[PDB]
Write a protein that binds this ligand. Structure first.
Ligand SMILES: Cc1cc2nc3c(=O)[nH]c(=O)nc-3n(C[C@H](O)[C@H](O)[C@H](O)COP(=O)(O)OP(=O)(O)OC[C@H]3O[C@@H](n4cnc5c(N)ncnc54)[C@H](O)[C@@H]3O)c2cc1C
Ligand SMILES: NC(=O)c1ccc[n+]([C@@H]2O[C@H](COP(=O)([O-])OP(=O)(O)OC[C@H]3O[C@@H](n4cnc5c(N)ncnc54)[C@H](O)[C@@H]3O)[C@@H](O)[C@H]2O)c1
Ligand SMILES: O=C(O)[C@@H]1CCCO1
Ligand SMILES: [Mg+2]
Length: 1207
């Protein structure tokens, strides 16, 4: 049995002094990076003046020398131009040129012309220079009809010829490498050279990686044949992306990268060596930089590649590590004797790096945040390169004439071909470099980066270009802006930075990850698993955590209690004993509730701000102890390191969010319920456990904490931390054990409320036990019950398959599918289903399943043998019905634990599924586009309503689907497992939950006897049926009830529509809707009128108990109100309901509550009042619990860029 964490994340090699200097700079504060760059980039006054003259001369030449002309000639609006180019693109997909021309002439031009507008975001950038994440396809369809009806065939022909020029000649150098080489003759004769890129990146499967390899290999042959001995400086070369060549290119898979990716790069390099051409490794995301250095090191030390100086490597000047990376590379060049070709660039992934660091809660960004800082960094790094031209070959890639001029003069008057060169991108830099290359200009060579491929393979690269072209900060954008003077364009960034008040200050309008929520609270901090210092320190902390004697005991107010004790075994290896749990006797569970009741007044008397300070102190302790907490979660609950970071971060965020919500709301009149029983699931064993307890405690209630029997150790540590933070032992008691302990707690006489997260079936048993119970005030015991899901994602033919597959693999198989939010049913539009399914199965087989104490493990075990047996029986039944089943093969080492292999099951109908299957099992169905609305019905028809995902680029489809789906958490163009506290308030409806949402603003109000007004909780909307009903009441003479109705209409927050603060590149929305049909059980006419006002003011329909005998009280209702009202004799026949309102004395409420609990389907949030309370208290029925919260998270970077960060 291997020692825990002894092989967690060993580095590829021992980190040298130079490598450690790189890692030290990874996220260094921007004010510390800039001063040495300013000093390195400083040049003499004479050179600065000379460079400004050269830059002015270049810019004047640029400004002094076809889509806009098409827009002008045919008077096209912006949308008409975009729509026309989408049509032209689609027409060009027809190969037979006469067949296309006849479709144009006879069918398109004459009238009624996969959505035509799938790529409109790209054409929008071409036409308008602005980026939209999604496409208004109804606007584009109207615009195309208008322009064709106005201008006919001529405008279509002009669009086709314009698209053909841009797509065949401007976006790519050629469709094939042979085409690109033939077209390179012209500029090679004028002094340019080329580096060809077979478009391709981010391989999803082994098959994709092999396709990109053979693309590269065939291009090396063609380029080498064409080079015909010109060598690495005067002849052409190739550029490659490491992410194209392996589907798991990441630090977490470093062993596979060195064992599988490295030999592939070596084979390509050997072929480049034989032809003597350059082979450049492009630079990609920040978390791949240092990994790529390990490949560079091995290749440059490999004797089989000796004699060849064509190996090249990009370094990104927008990165904080750039000068230290250059020190490492220059030293490697000296050690190896290879003259490494070093392409200095600014960087292509800036928007994505900002979003990623914010999402991961890291200490700082790995890139600069002011564009001028990247400019200074570039010039400083150029000075370093120009001092080492004997050992490296610098390649200065830039379109910025000021940057170019600065380097041209920095390099001085001595030049020979091979000393250094400039570089530019095809279709962007030729105007500038035609003023540079050649004896009549500056006589310096330029290498053109030449993309090669078809329109399909071109998307991602193209959008990075178009964003670059349209960004306000870009030289190529500003050169075209008439409001930008030449003097502004030649301003020296080095001197501009030197003169700023704080050299290197972070951008004013970009939040550090810790500051995403501003003054409200501090964001939880994560850990960078790509940082070698972090991995080394985490390895030691994880090993030390495995040496600790973790225990969980019954912790009563009076001290620990005795009980039956057993070991807790690692689910991924039952030989690894994690700790010991002593479980609670049912006698002691009852004693704990009595002690809680006795301690309730003392805890309620602690003022809310001091209760909140306890939560904040506990969050600080959890943040500080995160490495140790990670180790426990990994071993007790089968979580990977990434899963466990997210778990601890979530717990910190609950603590701080409920603390701040308390400070915003709770006062003396918001009295506590009393002892609250908190029952929690195994699968989020710290986060959900902490959240329920923290909310109940901070609302002034003493808590009985009953963790899942599977995961008591991390729960005990959470309680220990909360007690250390100041929660008195009498206010927070830990009762480990199984469902018998939970049931004994729920049944205890002094239990004043229950917070339950777990399976729907268990929630239903708790509902049943509470149905016969009333508070001393004669009201129902509040239950929050957050339950299972049957979560779907719908994917149409406009989605990007590579994005879909990544979000599907994560959503379905993260934590072995043991997330309540996990993707259970993937719904694929029929026309793209085969291609996406094939990619999904390929991605499935790249997952590593095993004991989770290794960074390389993607998917861990299931929690118990019973869970495994339950999941496997579902798979084998599906297999026995004839469904296609795909499964990863598991390594023999999984035999010591309880593992289920990630599984894909292809279903015929969505009704093939009954209940939630809580494991790594993805079901797939296909649909025809015209049946989309029916499909949404089928998804709704399960009765669940937790998470839901949609991948589409089409606004019409977003508006349709999101308006019809009934789920609590929606996700657009991203994974569906997001639950960031206060950003995606989390919780569903129907079989998935009663509400209110955890991590949302209505939560604390359920835990007090009088709910406060939540922050931002109001709406100016008034339900119109409520208004009609209030007028009807006035017509009937019920003046007091009509006034109460109007007041309910105003007080309702139905229609609240908020955007919540969060990371860039995301919109996170929070809205309040009707719940659905509310069951009304009135006793009196006036009670009925008040119940109906409450339900209508919150947008609901109603079913009214016919046994009330109150039918004569609703004579001659307006039709608008009548449409919302039904009478029910058999309640169980007319559901499902979404809540209930009850009127009566205590025994009537008890009897009705029992009848309601017996209704099939969802747990109902029931509110009860006596006739007298309805008369006395306008809030007898609380409108908070008659609306439904919906959270929607939209990935606005999904088109490949961030429009907000463009401006
Ligand atoms: C031949 C060639 C090859 C290239 N290869 C790669 C590569 O392998 N990997 C890669 O990542 N890039 C690469 N690039 C760079 C990238 O694709 C862009 O072309 C380049 O960053 C634009 O820089 P510039 O000097 O032309 O223009 P500029 O207008 O001078 O500079 C724009 C750049 O500033 C940076 N920037 C913008 N806003 C901010 C901000 N708020 N804070 C900090 N920085 C900011 C970005 O890097 C942006 O691209 C390459 C460029 C060329 C010409
Ligand atoms: N809606 C959400 O936010 C959410 C979040 C996480 C998990 N879940 C759901 O949780 C489930 C998985 O967690 P689980 O397997 O630990 O759930 P579970 O229903 O098996 O157990 C949950 C808790 O209830 C206790 N319990 C069992 N029987 C009881 C009884 N008769 N009376 C009182 N308490 C009893 C258990 O001991 C445990 O602490 C899944 O169905 C998942 O979808 C929902
Ligand atoms: O892929 C990109 O966008 C950059 C530019 C060229 C290579 O790396
Ligand atoms: Mg269970």
């Amino acid at each position: 049995a291997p020692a825990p964490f002894a092989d967690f994340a060993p580095p590829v090699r021992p980190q040298s002094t130079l490598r450690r200097a790189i890692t030290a700079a990874y996220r260094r504060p921007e004010t510390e990076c800039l001063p040495p760059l300013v000093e390195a980039a400083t040049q003499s006054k004479e050179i600065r003046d000379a460079a400004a003259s050269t830059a002015r001369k270049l810019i004047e030449a640029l400004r002094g020398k076809g889509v806009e002309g098409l827009v002008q000639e045919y008077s096209l609006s912006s949308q008409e131009g975009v729509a026309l180019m989408c049509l032209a693109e689609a027409l060009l997909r027809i190969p037979d040129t006469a067949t296309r021309d006849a479709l144009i002439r006879d069918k398109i031009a004459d009238g009624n012309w996969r959505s035509l507008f799938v790529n409109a975001a790209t054409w929008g950038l071409v036409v308008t220079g602005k980026l939209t994440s999604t496409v208004n396809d109804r606007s584009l369809a109207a615009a195309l009809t208008r322009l064709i009806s106005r201008c006919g065939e001529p405008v279509i022909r002009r669009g086709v010829d314009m698209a053909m020029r841009m797509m065949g000649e401007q976006f790519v150098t050629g469709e094939t490498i042979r085409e690109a080489l033939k077209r390179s003759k012209e500029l090679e004769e004028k002094g340019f050279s080329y580096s060809y890129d077979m478009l391709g990146e981010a391989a999803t499967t082994a098959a994709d990686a092999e396709r990109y390899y053979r693309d590269y290999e065939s291009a090396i042959h063609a380029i080498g044949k064409a080079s015909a001995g010109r060598g690495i400086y005067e002849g052409p070369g190739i550029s490659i992306k490491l992410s194209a060549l392996h589907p798991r290119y990441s630090r977490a898979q470093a062993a596979r990268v060195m064992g599988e990716l490295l030999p592939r790069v070596k084979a390509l390099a050997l072929l480049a060596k034989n032809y003597d051409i350059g082979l450049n490794i492009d630079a990609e995301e920040a978390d791949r930089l240092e990994l790529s250095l390990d490949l560079l090191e091995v290749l440059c030390l490999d004797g089989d590649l000796s004699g060849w100086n064509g190996m090249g490597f990009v370094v990104q000047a927008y990165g904080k590590r750039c000068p230290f990376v250059l020190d490492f590379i220059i030293d490697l060049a000296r050690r190896s004797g290879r003259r490494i070709m070093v392409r200095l660039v600014k960087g292509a992934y800036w928007d994505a790096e900002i979003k990623r660091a914010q999402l991961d809660g890291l200490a700082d960004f790995p890139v600069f945040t002011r564009k001028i800082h990247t400019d200074v960094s570039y010039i400083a790094c150029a000075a370093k390169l120009l001092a080492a031209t004997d050992v490296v070959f610098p390649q200065f890639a830039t379109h910025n004439a000021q940057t170019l001029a600065a380097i041209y003069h920095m390099a001085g008057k001595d030049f020979h071909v091979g000393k250094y060169e400039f570089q530019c991108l095809h279709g962007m830099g030729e105007p500038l470099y035609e003023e540079v290359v050649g004896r009549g200009k500056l006589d310096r060579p330029c290498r053109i980066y030449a993309p090669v491929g078809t329109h399909e393979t071109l998307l991602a690269y193209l959008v990075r270009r178009l964003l670059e072209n349209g960004a306000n900060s870009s030289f190529v954008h500003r050169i075209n802006d008439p409001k930008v003077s030449i003097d502004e364009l030649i301003a020296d960034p080095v001197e501009v930075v030197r003169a700023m008040p704080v050299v290197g200050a972070k951008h004013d309008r970009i939040a550090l990850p810790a500051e995403l929520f501003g003054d409200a609270r501090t964001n939880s901090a994560g850990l960078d698993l790509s940082n070698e210092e972090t991995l080394a320190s985490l390895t030691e902390a994880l090993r030390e955590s495995a040496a600790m004697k973790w225990t969980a005991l019954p912790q009563l107010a009076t001290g620990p209690a005795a009980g039956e004790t057993r070991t807790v075994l690692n689910p991924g290896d039952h030989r690894d004993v994690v700790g010991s749990v002593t479980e609670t006797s049912e006698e002691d569970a009852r004693r704990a509730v009595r002690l809680a009741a006795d301690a309730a007044p003392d805890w309620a008397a602690v003022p809310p701000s001091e209760r909140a300070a306890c939560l904040d102190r506990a969050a600080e302790l959890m943040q500080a102890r995160m490495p140790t907490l990670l180790g426990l979660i990994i071993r007790e609950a089968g979580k990977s390191a990434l899963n466990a970071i997210a778990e601890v971060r979530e717990a910190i965020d609950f603590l701080r969010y409920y603390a701040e919500q308390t400070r915003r709301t709770l006062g003396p009149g918001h009295g506590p319920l009393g002892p609250i029983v908190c029952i929690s699931p195994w699968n989020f064993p710290l986060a959900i456990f902490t959240g329920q307890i923290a909310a109940a405690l901070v609302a002034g209630n003493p808590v009985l904490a009953k963790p899942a029997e599977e995961t008591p150790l991390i729960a005990a540590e959470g309680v220990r931390i909360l007690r250390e933070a100041g929660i008195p032992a009498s206010a927070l008691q830990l009762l480990p054990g199984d469902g018998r302990v939970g049931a004994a707690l729920v049944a205890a006489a002094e239990t004043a409320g229950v917070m339950f997260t777990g399976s729907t079936e268990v929630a239903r048993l708790i509902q049943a036990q509470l149905a016969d119970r009333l508070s001393p005030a004669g009201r129902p015991i509040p239950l929050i019950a957050e339950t299972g899901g049957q979560n779907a994602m719908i994917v149409d033919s406009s989605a990007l398959a590579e994005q879909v597959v990544g979000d599907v693999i994560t959503s379905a198989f993260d934590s072995a599918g043991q997330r309540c939010s996990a993707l259970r049913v993937l719904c694929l539009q029929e026309d793209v289903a085969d291609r996406i399914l094939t990619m999904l199965k390929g991605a499935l087989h790249e997952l590593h399943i095993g004991r989770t104490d290794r960074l390389s493990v993607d998917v861990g075990p299931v929690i118990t043998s019973e869970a495994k047996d339950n999941i496997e029986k579902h798979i084998e039944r599906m297999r026995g019905l004839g469904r296609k089943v795909e499964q990863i093969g598991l390594a023999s080492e999984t035999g010591v634990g309880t593992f289920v292999p990630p599984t894909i099951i292809e279903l015929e109908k969505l009704s093939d599924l009954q209940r939630e299957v809580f494991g790594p099992v993805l079901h797939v169905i296909r649909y025809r586009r015209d049946d989309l609305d029916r499909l949404v019905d089928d998804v709704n028809a399960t009765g669940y309503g937790l998470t839901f995902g949609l991948h589409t680029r089409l606004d019409e489809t977003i508006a349709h689907v999101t308006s019809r789906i009934k789920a609590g958490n929606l996700y657009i163009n991203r994974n569906i497992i997001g639950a960031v506290v206060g950003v995606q308030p989390f919780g569903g409806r129907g079989l998935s939950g009663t509400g209110p949402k955890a991590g949302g603003p209505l939560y604390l109000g359920r835990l007090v006897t009088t709910a406060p007004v939540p922050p931002q909780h109001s709406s100016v909307h008034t339900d119109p049926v409520l208004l009609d009903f209030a007028k009807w009441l006035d017509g009937k003479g019920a003046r007091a009830e009509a006034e109460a109705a109007r007041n309910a209409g105003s007080s309702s927050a139905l229609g609240l529509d908020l955007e919540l603060p969060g990371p860039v590149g995301e919109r996170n929305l929070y809205t309040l809707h009707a719940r659905g049909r509310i069951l009304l059980v009135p006793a009196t006419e006036s009670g009925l009128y008040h119940q109906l006002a409450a339900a209508l003011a919150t947008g609901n329909s109603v079913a009214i108990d016919a046994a009330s005998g109150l039918q004569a009280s609703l004579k001659n209702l307006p039709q608008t109100v009548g449409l919302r009202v039904s009478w029910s004799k058999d309640w169980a026949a007319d559901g499902p309901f979404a809540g209930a309102l009850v009127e009566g004395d205590a025994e009537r409420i008890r009897a009705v509550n029992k009848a309601i609990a017996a209704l099939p389907g969802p747990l109902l949030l029931v509110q009860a009042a006596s006739s007298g309370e309805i008369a006395r208290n306008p809030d007898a029925y609380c409108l908070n619990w008659l609306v439904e919260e919906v959270s929607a998270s939209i990935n606005t970077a999904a088109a490949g860029g961030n429009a907000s960060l463009m401006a």
